[PDB]
Amino acid sequence: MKVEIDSFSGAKIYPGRGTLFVRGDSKIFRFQNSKSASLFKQRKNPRRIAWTVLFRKHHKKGI
Amino acid sequence: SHRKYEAPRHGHLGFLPRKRAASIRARVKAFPKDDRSKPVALTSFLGYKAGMTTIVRDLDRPGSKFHKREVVEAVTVVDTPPVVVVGVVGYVETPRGLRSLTTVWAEHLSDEVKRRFYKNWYKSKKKAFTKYSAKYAQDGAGIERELARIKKYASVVRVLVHTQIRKTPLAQKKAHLAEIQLNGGSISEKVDWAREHFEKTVAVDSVFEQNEMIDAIAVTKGHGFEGVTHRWGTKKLPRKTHRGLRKVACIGAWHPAHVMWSVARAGQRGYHSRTSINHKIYRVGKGDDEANGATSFDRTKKTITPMGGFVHYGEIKNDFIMVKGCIPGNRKRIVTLRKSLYTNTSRKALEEVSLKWIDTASKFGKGRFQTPAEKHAFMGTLKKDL
Amino acid sequence: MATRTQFENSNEIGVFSKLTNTYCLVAVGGSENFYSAFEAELGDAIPIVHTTIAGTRIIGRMTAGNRRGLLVPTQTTDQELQHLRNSLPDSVKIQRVEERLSALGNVICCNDYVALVHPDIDRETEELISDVLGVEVFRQTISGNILVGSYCSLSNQGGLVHPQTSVQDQEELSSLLQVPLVAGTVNRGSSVVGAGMVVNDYLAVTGLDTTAPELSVIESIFRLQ
Amino acid sequence: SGNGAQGTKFRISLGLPVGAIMNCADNSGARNLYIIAVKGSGSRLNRLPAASLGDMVMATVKKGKPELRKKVMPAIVVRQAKSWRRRDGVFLYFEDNAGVIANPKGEMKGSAITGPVGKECADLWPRVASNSGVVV
RNA sequence: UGAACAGCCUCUAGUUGAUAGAAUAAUGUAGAUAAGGGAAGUCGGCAAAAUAGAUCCGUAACUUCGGGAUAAGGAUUGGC
RNA sequence: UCUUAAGGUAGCCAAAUGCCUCGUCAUCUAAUUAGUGACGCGCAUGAAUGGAUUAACGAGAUUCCCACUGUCCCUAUCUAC
RNA sequence: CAGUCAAGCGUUCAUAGCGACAUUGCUUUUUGAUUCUUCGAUGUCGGCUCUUCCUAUCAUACCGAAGCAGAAUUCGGUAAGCGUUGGAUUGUUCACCCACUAAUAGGGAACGUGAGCUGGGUUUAGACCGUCGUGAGACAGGUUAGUUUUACCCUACUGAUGAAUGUUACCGCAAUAGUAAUUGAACUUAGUACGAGAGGAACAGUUCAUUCGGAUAAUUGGUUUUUGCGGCUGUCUGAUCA
Ligand SMILES: [Mg+2]
Ligand SMILES: [Mg+2]
Ligand SMILES: [Mg+2]
Ligand SMILES: [Mg+2]
Chain D residues whose CB is inside 8 A of the C54 CB are 119, 135
Please report residues contacting nucleic strand E, using a CB cutoff of 7 A.
B 224-227, 229-230, 238-240, 242-247, 266; D 15-22, 48, 50, 81-83, 96-97
Greatest CA separation for chain B: 82
For residue B146, give the 3-state DSSP assignment: helix
Neighbours of C184 (CB within 10 A): 19
Residue D66, Ramachandran bin (φ over 0: left; ψ between -120 and 50: alpha; else beta): alpha
Q: Which nucleotide lies nearest residue B268, CA to C1'?
A: G159
Binary contact (D129, C61; C-beta < 8 A): yes
How far is the C-alpha of B307 from the C-alpha of C10, rounded, in Å? 51
How far is the C-alpha of C180 from the C-alpha of C195, rounded, in Å? 20
Neighbours of D92 (CB within 10 A): 17
On whether the CB atoms of residues B4 and B146 are closer than 8 A, the answer is: no
Strands B44-59 and B355-358: antiparallel
Could you say which of A16, A33, A62 has the minimum Cβ distance to residue B54?
Answer: A16
Domain extents in chain C:
1-225
**Nearest 5 degrees, angle CA D98-CA D104-CA D108?**
50
Put simply, whether A43 touches D (Cβ < 8 Å) is no
D21 occurs within a structural domain:
yes
* CATH number for the segment(s) C1-225: 3.75.10.10
CA of B311 to the centre of ligand 3 (A): 8
Backbone torsions φ then ψ of C13, nearest 5 degrees: -90, -25
The CATH number of the domain holding residue D105 is: 2.40.150.20
CA of D40 to the centre of ligand 2 (A): 24
H helices within chain D, ranges in order?
119-122, 126-131
Nucleotides of G under 7 A from a protein CB: 47-53, 82-87, 98-104, 106-113, 115-119, 149, 156-161, 168-175, 178-180, 184-189, 191, 206-222
List residues bridging with C48 in a β-sheet: C24
On whether the CB atoms of residues B283 and B295 are closer than 8 A, the answer is: no
How far is the C-alpha of C141 from the C-alpha of C147, rounded, in Å? 8
Put simply, whether C100 touches A (Cβ < 8 Å) is yes
Chain B residues whose CB is inside 8 A of the C55 CB are 66, 69
Q: Which nucleotide lies nearest residue B28, CA to C1'?
A: G172
Q: Which nucleotide lies nearest residue B237, CA to C1'?
A: G49
Binary contact (A20, D88; C-beta < 8 A): no
Residue C204 to chain D, least CA–CA distance (Å)? 19
On whether the CB atoms of residues C218 and C206 are closer than 8 A, the answer is: yes
D77 occurs within a structural domain:
yes
Residue A15 to chain B, least CA–CA distance (Å)? 7
SS (H, E, C) chain C: CEEECCECCECCHHHHEEECCCCEEEECCCCHHHHHHHHHHHCCCCCEEEECECCECCCCCCCEECCCEEEECCCCCHHHHHHHHHHCCCCCEEEECCCCCCCHHHHCEECCCEEEECCCCCHHHHHHHHHHCCCEEEECCECCECCHHHHCEECCCCEEECCCCCHHHHHHHHHHHCCCEEECCECCCECCHHHHCEECCCCEEECCCCCHHHHHHHHHHHCCC
Could you say which of A11, A15, A62 has the minimum Cβ distance to residue B72?
Answer: A15
For residue B34, give the 3-state DSSP assignment: coil
User: In 3D, which of D106, D98, D40 has the Cα closest to residue D73?
Assistant: D106
On whether the CB atoms of residues C211 and C185 are closer than 8 A, the answer is: no
Binary contact (A26, C101; C-beta < 8 A): yes
Binary contact (D90, A26; C-beta < 8 A): no
User: In 3D, which of C86, C101, C11 has the Cα closest to residue C49?
Assistant: C86
Chain B residues whose CB is inside 8 A of the D46 CB are 235
What domains are defined for chain B?
Answer: 16-81+203-220+270-384 (2.40.30.10), 82-202 (3.30.1430.10)
Residues with CB under 5 A from ligand 4 (ion): D 46
Put simply, whether D42 touches B (Cβ < 8 Å) is no
How far is the C-alpha of A50 from the C-alpha of A34, rounded, in Å? 17
- Look at chain D and report how many structural domains it folds into: 1
Resolution of the coordinates in A? Answer: 2.6
How far is the C-alpha of B114 from the C-alpha of B123, rounded, in Å? 14
H helices within B40-186, ranges in order?
111-114, 130-135, 144-152
How far is the C-alpha of B344 from the C-alpha of B142, rounded, in Å? 45
Distance measured from the CA of protein residue B85 to the C1' of nucleotide G195, in angstroms: 75
How far is the C-alpha of B187 from the C-alpha of B382, rounded, in Å? 66
Structural domain harbouring D29: 15-136
How far is the C-alpha of B359 from the C-alpha of D22, rounded, in Å? 39
Binary contact (C10, D126; C-beta < 8 A): yes
